[PDB]
Each structure stands twice: as C-alpha cells, then as structure tokens.
Amino acid sequence: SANVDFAFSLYKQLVLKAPDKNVIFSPLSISTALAFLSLGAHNTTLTEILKGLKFNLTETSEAEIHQSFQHLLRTLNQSSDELQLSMGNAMFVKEQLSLLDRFTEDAKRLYGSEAFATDFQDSAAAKKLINDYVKNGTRGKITDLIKDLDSQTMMVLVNYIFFKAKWEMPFDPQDTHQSRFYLSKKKWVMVPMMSLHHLTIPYFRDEELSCTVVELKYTGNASALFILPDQDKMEEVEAMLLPETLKRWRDSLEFREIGELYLPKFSISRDYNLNDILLQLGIEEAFTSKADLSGITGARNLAVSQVVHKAVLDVFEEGREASAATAVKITLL
Amino acid sequence: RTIVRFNRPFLMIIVPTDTQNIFFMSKVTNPKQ
Numbered sequence A: 001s002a003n004v005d006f007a008f009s010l011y012k013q014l015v016l017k018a019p020d021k022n023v024i025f026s027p028l029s030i031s032t033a034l035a036f037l038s039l040g041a042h043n044t045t046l047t048e049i050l051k052g053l054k055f056n057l058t059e060t061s062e063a064e065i066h067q068s069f070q071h072l073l074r075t076l077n078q079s080s081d082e083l084q085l086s087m088g089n090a091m092f093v094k095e096q097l098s099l100l101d102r103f104t105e106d107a108k109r110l111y112g113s114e115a116f117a118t119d120f121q122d123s124a125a126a127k128k129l130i131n132d133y134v135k136n137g138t139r140g141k142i143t144d145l146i147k148d149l150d151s152q153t154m155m156v157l158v159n160y161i162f163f164k165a166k167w168e169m170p171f172d173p174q175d176t177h178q179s180r181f182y183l184s185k186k187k188w189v190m191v192p193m194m195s196l197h198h199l200t201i202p203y204f205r206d207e208e209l210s211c212t213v214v215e216l217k218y219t220g221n222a223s224a225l226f227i228l229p230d231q232d233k234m235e236e237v238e239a240m241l242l243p244e245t246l247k248r249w250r251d252s253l254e255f256r257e258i259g260e261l262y263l264p265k266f267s268i269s270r271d272y273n274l275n276d277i278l279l280q281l282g283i284e285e286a287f288t289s290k291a292d293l294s295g296i297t298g299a300r301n302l303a304v305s306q307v308v309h310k311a312v313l314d315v316f317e318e319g320r321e322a323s324a325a326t327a328v329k330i331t332l333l
Numbered sequence B: 001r002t003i004v005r006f007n008r009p010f011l012m013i014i015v016p017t018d019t020q021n022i023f024f025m026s027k028v029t030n031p032k033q
Helices: A002-016 A027-038 A043-052 A062-076 A101-110 A120-137 A234-239 A243-252 A275-280
Strands: A023-025 A084-094 A115-118 A153-164 A177-184 A187-206 A211-217 A222-229 A254-264 A266-273 A302-316 A319-332 B002-005 B010-016 B024-028
Touching: A002 A023, A002 A027, A002 A234, A002 A243, A002 A275, A002 B024, A023 A266, A023 A302, A027 A043, A027 A062, A027 A084, A027 A153, A027 A302, A027 A319, A043 A062, A062 A084, A062 A101, A084 A120, A115 A120, A120 A153, A120 A319, A153 A302, A187 A243, A222 A234, A222 A243, A266 A275, A266 B024, A275 A302, A302 B024
Parallel strands: A084 A115, A254 B002
Antiparallel strands: A023 B024, A084 A153, A153 A319, A177 A187, A187 A211, A187 A254, A211 A222, A222 B010, A266 A302, A302 A319, B010 B024
C-alpha cells in the first residue's frame, strides 16, 4: 500500500538527519493525522498532501482515501481481551472560530473526532488540556507532546496510538543476562540480553541483502519482524527498505527450530519536528501564505505551523508496550 | 541448531496480520539510549 511506502520514505530521512541514533516512530499515526488534515485542504494544498503520503491520486480518489482510514480506525479500534490497541483523532478548536458543518461532520464520521473548545489565549492551560488527552489515550506513556504553543494559535489536530500485547512465547526473567552488544567491530558495551531455547519461529536468511529475518508473535493479530543486518551491512539494508522488500520477506518466512535466540531488553523514546522532512516529501504550500485550508472555515485563513511527533517503545520479557502521538499546530493566516 | 543473536544494530517493525500498514518502525543502534 501507500502507507508502508510513506513509512519507509520518512524512515530514510530520519536516518540522514541523524545517522547513528536509535530510531522509533509510528507511521500509521502520522498518515492518519495528515490525512485528517486533507479534509480542509483544497486545490494545490490538498494535492501536495495526498501525494506526499504516497497515495496515487489517479488510481485513488480523494473520497476513496478518507473512506479507507474510516474503516481502518473502525477495525483498528478492536481492543478486546487478548491485546490492547486503540487509536483516536481529535481537534481542539479555538473557542470562537466557526468551522463549516461539512468539516465538523466528516471529521466525526470519517476520522472519529471531536471538537473541543480551546482558549488558546491561555497557552499554559491550552497546552495542558491537549497534553492530558494524549497522556490519557496512551495510558500515561506520552508525556508532553506539545512542548510549546503559539499565542496566535487557532486549532490543533491530534492523533495517538496505544498498543499493549504480551508475547506468545515469553522470555523468562531467570534467563536475562549482562552480555556484549557491539556498537561496532571494536566497540562494545554490556547490556541485559533476553533468551529462548529450541524455539520454532518463522525464519529467512536473506542472502541477497545479507541479513536474517525472524518473526515473534504477540497474543492476537500483531507481530514483530526483526532484521539483523550483517556486520557492516546496515547501510545496504536500509537503502532497500522498499514496500516490495517487506512483502518478499513476509512471503519468504518458513518455520524453523532455532537452538537459542537472543534479544536485548530495552526502552527507547524519541520525538521529532517533521516540518523539514515533510517539506522534502513535497508538503510545501500548506506551510506558507499560499495555503488553502478553506474546507475548515470557508475562508482561507489558516496555515500549518509545525507538525511534531513523539513515540515510545518498551521491549521486555513480557513484550510490554509501544505508543506514539502526533499533533498539527495550525495558526491564523 | 541455528542461532540468532541480536548483538549488533538491528531493525524491528511491528506489523498487524491482516491490514498491511506499519504500526511502529524502529532501529536499535545502542540499547542504552
């Protein structure tokens, strides 16, 4: 799909922008938030946005696009007794700024949103509310998404995803041990390494791109694909992250009995300001005066300020959790 | 028996079973931030 395409497009940029740092983000959370943005975008503003999300505007109509995310949100939000997973969309609109019925309707119908009256004049409290809605939805993992809030702010659209599922063959705490993790060939550090013995899991040694793919399921409809690139093969590997590579990998995995497997117990949390990257993907007009967001108010008097994103991943003996959230700070034009 | 030892930089993608999208994309260069 376009989604996993957009996803790998962003990844590679996040990398160029900072080569040797751990990366962690949620693509779906970003696509749904910007897609949400489309409902107000018109003419060129809208065109740019859709194409930036790697959607093919000639095969897929605008309406086709929104109808999808609706259905996705529906199904995605199936947090039943087995694994937790929910996604939500909301928009805190400045107390006295009327939005066309259509927008307020399609937002609730297609993206499940709400319109909360926000007095942005009180940036201290406005930021508070929004931060507490995300903290709430993520069960307290994403604290302080909105770092700063402009005074001339008119509205902010936010999305968030919470996911909690135990493994399907847990690691036993008794087996975790301090071992070497090689930052590079002659550079190593000691870290808690989790284990598993005589394990039967999907496997694929990719000779072409020189890396081993392995699969570990969570209880329920979700799983973790791990790719261990060969020593010095990371650069090559990251270059080939194409929607076609992922399908080939998934389609090549066959069951194998592994003598022993080792995975590092860890927790990483990174946040970003996607302005630059989004501008490199082609989303430019929405950031200038030329921005057409007339679908929101009828008048063309809004423009994108910045788009930020925070994410957290915890990989423990019990699987644990991951969460991410995204917000689009819109200001007057 | 084949051994899998994630003791150097690796990638990790959390994928649903049906609807092929990507929930979380990540790369671990050092387990300690």
